């Protein structure tokens, strides 16, 4: 195993919401600890491939930046992340995606698991898996956001 770290915080002015997805498990990774105090999620990741989903929101700016990063972990414990996608848009539009009936579910779910005020977000025990592989999946999200934006 190897310990990794992302941000999950929702304050007065901004919100940084990062979740990490398991490429193999085809659903989000169950985090071993959450840090309400410093607004952080702590993961114990089997060496493998992982997508990190980033949502960054300046509320007062009605600003939302959504990213997707590829997180590669080797058996030597070495971590390397890279962004593969990024877009910037109105937060109001992003909050609207939650209620979009015909949308990329994992996306509608990520958004939906955003952190409650001053709390962190959380992930639930699951064996559930989406239909598509990580490529299709990412692409479906991209294809949508473009039409959405
Ligand atoms: Ni490798």
What fold is seen in the domain 1-149? Immunoglobulin-like (2.60.40)
Resolution of the PDB structure in angstroms: 3.3
Distance from Cα 79 to the centre of ligand 1, integer Å: 10
Distance from Cα 72 to the centre of ligand 1, integer Å: 7
Distance from Cα 120 to the centre of ligand 1, integer Å: 31
Distance from Cα 133 to the centre of ligand 1, integer Å: 19
Q: Which two tokens stand for residue 68?
A: 């997707």
User: In the chain, where are the structural domains located?
Assistant: 1-149
The rounded distance, in Å, linking the Cα atoms of 121 and 117 is 10
- Reduced to 3 states (helix: H, G, I; strand: E, B; else coil), residue 14 is strand
- Reduced to 3 states (helix: H, G, I; strand: E, B; else coil), residue 33 is strand
- Residue that has been written with the tokens 């962190």 in this structure: 120
Q: How many CB atoms lie within 10 A of CB 106?
A: 20
How many Cα neighbours within 13 Å face the side chain of 46?
A: 8
β-strand partners of 88: 65
Please name which of 144, 70, 64 lies closest in space to residue 105, comparing C-alpha atoms.
Answer: 144
Distance from Cα 56 to the centre of ligand 1, integer Å: 29
Q: Is 137 exposed, middle or buried (0-12, 13-18, 19+ CB in 10 A)?
A: buried
The rounded distance, in Å, linking the Cα atoms of 34 and 56 is 18
**Residue 103 neighbours by CB under 8 Å, 6+ apart:** 97, 144
The rounded distance, in Å, linking the Cα atoms of 16 and 74 is 27
């Amino acid at each position: 195993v190897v310990e990794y770290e992302v941000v999950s915080k929702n304050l007065t002015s901004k919100m940084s919401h990062e979740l990490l997805f398991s490429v193999k498990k085809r659903w989000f990774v169950k985090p071993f600890r959450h840090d309400r105090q410093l607004g952080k999620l702590h993961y114990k990741l089997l060496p493998g491939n992982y997508i990190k989903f980033g949502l960054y929101v300046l509320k007062n700016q009605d600003y939302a930046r959504f990213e997707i990063a590829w997180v590669h972990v080797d058996k030597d414990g070495k971590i390397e992340a890279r962004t593969v996608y990024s877009i910037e848009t109105y937060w109001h539009i992003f909050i609207d995606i939650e209620n979009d009936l015909n949308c990329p579910y994992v996306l509608a779910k990520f958004i939906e698991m955003r952190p409650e005020f001053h709390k962190t977000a959380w992930v639930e025990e699951s064996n559930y898996s989406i239909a598509e592989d990580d490529i299709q999946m990412v692409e479906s999200i991209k294809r949508y956001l473009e039409r959405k934006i």
